[PDB]
Design a protein around this nucleic acid. Structure first.
Ligand SMILES: [Mg+2]
Length: 778
RNA sequence: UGGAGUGUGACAAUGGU
RNA sequence: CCAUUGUCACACUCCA
């Protein structure tokens, strides 16, 4: 039917003013009429068809139409200011640069602003040039060259969206690099970086220049007045040392001097960017959020939708100022640490912190391990020193480490990885009278080349041993931060936890810490390798302790090729021995939660990540039906209130600060503070969703996460969801900062990306039991 | 593959005509 | 055709 409505706006948190990029567009719903084309031929060239329509209209702008400027999308459709008096016009206006075109002519906001978007694209095409959807214009921000002849301006790309303030036009900034409009002499001088007038060019250099100039339009300069432009037919094999240029038809071999041509501002694309060019473009493409806001503001002031014949003939209005919206800043939560450490409560300042004089909540006390060395550079002494230093860092960071390994560090070679792992596991099994190995510190080389894949495939699919890898350069140059951040992984990998929310411990967080609640997750990772052969694999994670929700336990399965839905939540196959057996992922995760806590969950919160607005409804229907069926098949009369929350990240809605000279910014990359929520004036007006940016920026802008709360049953308040999501966004296991998208929907993608190595329709090999209950993937 | 983030390229899924 | 999103790869920056 319909999604879950909005139960209001929040009030808690501080106040601040954020200026997003959503220019409100006063829609002119006076009158708009569509039309069509009755053409006997067919032209597939968008630009050519557009020129045709323009010329044909000019041929009869005032003769028959009358004081009108009709539009044209690019298909069988024309949009005017109304219904024109004529009904049976006949025109066969040809184009000369050649077939007769015989013709016989015969809810309020959506259609009107679809016409608005059509005329927007028409204006952009008429003024600037088109390129992969995004229009780019030179005279925007003083374009400058970044390479030999490649110079990059600042383009843009609009998209109307039916937001809350009345539908609004959107704007973003995209950059492309095109060749400079300079004489060929200077172009060659900059390309080769050497003297060219007195120094003859080599054959390889000549071939490179010919390839670079292939397809480049050139205008003759030997004529003062007739500077006709021609396409480059080729370069002749034979300052007279400069080879002649072939233009025109291949049969009509015309030779011109290299100095008798010029660049005609190339249209589509230049030669593929190199390493030295991509770095400069990256240095220029993304700037501080202040500069991003300035360019977004400028690209509409320059484009000037206000003063335009189309705007005059329709009345459409777009304010040249970015939208100003109020957006509360949620407060950071309190974190409880083990009492043995100097500090027991640390609050995150700007969304990040470090464990100075702090100790993890639970130390799993690893006492058996081995270190396998997959390299020739690092040797026994260096590997033993690295292991000892990691042990000392782990002991000072919270859990006891056995100072000496079970077996001496078994050096090996990359090719015999299976033999090395088998020997190490079996030797250490033989010793200690058969006690399983807690962890193995692999040390794999810099450019492993599937060694990492083979290692993390064997150690989990076949052996059942929790592993941990470190590159060679880190071993050679160890740092306290690096050792601490690997110690966090080692601690969470053994079923322990290291950070816990103070609110959850006290059982005070709303609608979560009063009855058993499990916070799920989901994601997919398509193969992008061939077609119909490599299955796309799906992952699901779920919490496994109610008083504090920090421990997850994921499990993965393969599914059909490039299917976005999580194919198998609840699958039933006939089994004559047992009957109509059930299974999937939901049954297994609920069973694991029940075993690991004691009480069946009584409220499911689900964080399905990565779906499109086009298929929100279909994915909601299928996943929620699967959840209901799975839970109903676990115990009769067991229907927990589910709460879908779809997470999106790749969205083109930025967020800046009202004044960029104040304390309303982070330490660096002075965009918004970590924790802002913007659920007013930029969102789906009738569906409950809210932007959010829980992660401190580092450079460039900060792409806020766009949570889109789908079907909701247990009646969360909007402030309740915002607070719970921001708070949950802090308890990240493998890091000490604040994550962008919440860990329940982060671990899913992380485990799905992990599971791609397990394969080598066609389900993946199962994970061993003793590496499933713990966070193997993280 | 210590981790977090934001730029680009390539490829891909889905909604309306 | 017009979009909304996703995966992968590379580059850069930052952490005690
Ligand atoms: Mg993902």
């Amino acid at each position: 039917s319909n999604f879950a409505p909005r139960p209001g706006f929040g009030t808690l948190g501080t106040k601040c003013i954020v200026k997003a990029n959503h220019f409100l567009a006063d829609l002119p719903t006076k009158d708009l009429n569509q039309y069509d084309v009755t053409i006997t031929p067919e032209v597939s060239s968008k630009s050519v068809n557009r020129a045709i329509i323009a010329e044909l209209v000019r041929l009869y702008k005032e003769s028959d139409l009358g004081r009108r400027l009709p539009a044209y999308d690019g298909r069988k459709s024309l949009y005017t200011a109304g219904e024109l008096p004529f009904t049976w016009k006949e025109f066969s206006v040809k184009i000369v640069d050649e077939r007769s075109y015989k013709v016989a002519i015969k809810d309020c906001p959506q259609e009107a602003v679809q016409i608005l978007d059509i005329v927007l694209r028409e204006l952009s095409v008429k003024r600037f040039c088109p390129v992969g959807r995004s229009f780019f214009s030179p005279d925007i921000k003083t374009p400058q060259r970044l390479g030999e002849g490649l110079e990059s301006w600042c383009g843009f790309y609009q998209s109307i969206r039916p937001t809350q303030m009345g539908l609004s036009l959107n704007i973003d900034m995209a950059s492309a690099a095109f060749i400079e409009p300079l004489p060929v002499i200077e172009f060659v001088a900059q390309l080769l970086g050497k003297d060219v007038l007195s120094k003859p060019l080599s054959d390889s250099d000549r071939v490179k220049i010919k390839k670079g100039l292939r397809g480049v339009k050139v205008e003759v300069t030997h004529r003062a007045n007739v500077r006709r432009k021609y396409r480059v037919a080729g370069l002749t094999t034979q300052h007279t040392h400069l080879p002649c240029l072939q233009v025109g038809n291949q049969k009509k071999a015309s030779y011109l001097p290299m100095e008798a041509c010029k660049i005609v501002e190339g249209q589509r694309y230049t030669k593929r960017l190199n390493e030295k060019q991509i770095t400069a473009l990256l240095k220029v493409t993304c700037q501080r959020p202040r500069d991003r806001e300035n360019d977004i503001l400028r690209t509409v002031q320059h484009n000037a939708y206000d003063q335009d014949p189309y705007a005059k003939e329709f009345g459409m209005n777009i304010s040249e100022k970015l939208a100003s919206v109020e957006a509360r800043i949620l407060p950071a939560p309190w974190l409880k640490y083990h009492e043995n450490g100097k500090e027991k409560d640390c609050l995150p300042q700007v969304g990040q912190w470090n464990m100075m004089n702090k100790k993890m909540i639970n130390g799993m006390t690893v006492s058996r391990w081995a270190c396998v060395n997959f390299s020739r550079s690092v040797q026994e002494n260096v590997a033993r020193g690295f292991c000892n230093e990691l042990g000392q860092m782990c002991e000072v960071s919270g859990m006891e480490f056995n100072p000496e390994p079970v077996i001496p560090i078994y050096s090996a070679r990359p090719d015999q990885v299976e033999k090395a792992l088998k020997h190490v596991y079996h030797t250490s099994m033989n010793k200690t009278k058969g006690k399983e190995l807690e962890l193995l510190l692999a040390i794999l080389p810099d450019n492993n080349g599937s060694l990492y894949g083979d290692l993390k495939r064997i150690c989990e699919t076949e052996l059942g041993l929790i592993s941990q890898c470190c590159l060679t350069k880190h071993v050679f140059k160890i740092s306290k931060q690096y050792l601490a951040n690997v110690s966090l992984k080692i601690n969470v990998k053994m079923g322990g936890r290291n950070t816990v929310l103070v609110d959850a411990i006290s059982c005070r967080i709303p609608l979560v810490s009063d009855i058993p609640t499990i916070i799920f997750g989901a994601d997919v990772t398509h193969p992008e390798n061939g077609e119909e052969s490599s299955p796309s694999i799906a992952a699901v994670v779920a919490s496994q302790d109610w008083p504090e929700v920090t421990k997850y336990a994921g499990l993965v399965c393969a599914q059909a090729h490039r299917q976005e839905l999580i194919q198998d939540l609840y699958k039933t196959w006939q089994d004559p021995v047992r009957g109509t057996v059930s299974g999937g992922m939901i049954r297994d995760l609920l069973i694991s939660f029940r075993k690991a806590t004691g009480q069946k969950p009584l409220r499911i919160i689900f964080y399905r990540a990565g779906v499109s607005e086009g298929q929100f409804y279909q994915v909601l229907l299928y996943e929620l039906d699967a959840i209901r069926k799975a839970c109903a098949s676990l115990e009769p009369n067991y229907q927990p209130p589910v709460t879908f929350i779809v997470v999106q990240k790749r969205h083109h809605t930025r967020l800046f600060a009202n004044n960029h000279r104040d304390k309303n910014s982070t330490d660096r990359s002075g965009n918004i503070l970590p924790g802002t929520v913007v659920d007013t004036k930029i969102c789906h007006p009738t569906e409950f969703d809210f932007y959010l940016c829980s992660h401190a920026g580092i450079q460039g802008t900060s792409r806020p996460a766009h949570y889109h709360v789908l079907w909701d049953e247990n009646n969360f308040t909007a402030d309740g969801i915002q607070s719970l999501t921001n708070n949950l966004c802090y308890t990240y296991a493998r890091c000490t900062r604040s994550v962008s998208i919440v860990p329940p929907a982060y671990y899913a993608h992380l485990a799905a990306f992990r599971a791609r190595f397990y394969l080598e329709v066609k389900p993946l090999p199962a994970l061993k039991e003793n590496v499933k209950r713990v966070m193997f993937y993280c």
